[PDB]
Amino acid sequence: VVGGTEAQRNSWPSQISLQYRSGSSWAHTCGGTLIRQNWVMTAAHCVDRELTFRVVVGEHNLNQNNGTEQYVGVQKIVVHPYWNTDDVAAGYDIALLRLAQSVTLNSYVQLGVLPRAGTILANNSPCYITGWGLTRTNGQLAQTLQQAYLPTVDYAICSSSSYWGSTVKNSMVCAGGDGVRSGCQGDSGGPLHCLVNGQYAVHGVTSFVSRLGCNVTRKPTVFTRVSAYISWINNVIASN
């Protein structure tokens, strides 16, 4: 997250850190949202690599013991059948991870609230992106969870020539684009929390940013629109 602020320890309990085994240790690669005690929602591009993944819930500082973490292996990965690694702009950048064990819920580990199917946010709706992603374009991961206020940019505007053009689809949510705040590498797969009817719900799964940089004016961060996949999500969980 570029241009973010450090999140409070218990502000985003559904946020998870998806890590892969690197040598004798683990490395954070993406974010995700805990949606069931044994299911995590993340981006499909996060799991394209044939790596060994683990999920960490109740995480705050990637480099120090917080006394609230729970580590669990990923038992099964279900990527959306229409996902094409060579075409992120086509959409379907979503995957569900079934955890080897069901995590324990508490103040630091909670299920993310998903929006009602088909829900579309009005332009400039209040949302926060959270993650441990790069704090600057071509920079380094944050040590502590970051959050950045990123108001949505509706489809009409986001798909205009000045913005993303045909690159963005209606199956996506755009947010930010002010040139200062944005998601960045390492935030992928994480949540876009938007306040609706007094309750924050996860409306987006961080998908992509501009090849020119993370915080680029008129190139808002693009997320997979969760409300477009409610049936798919329910179908996967019910069948696994």
Binding site: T167, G183, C184, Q185, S188, T206, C214
Partner: peptide, 4 residues
């Protein structure tokens, strides 16, 4: 496009 840049998957992040």
């Amino acid at each position: 496009v840049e998957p992040x």
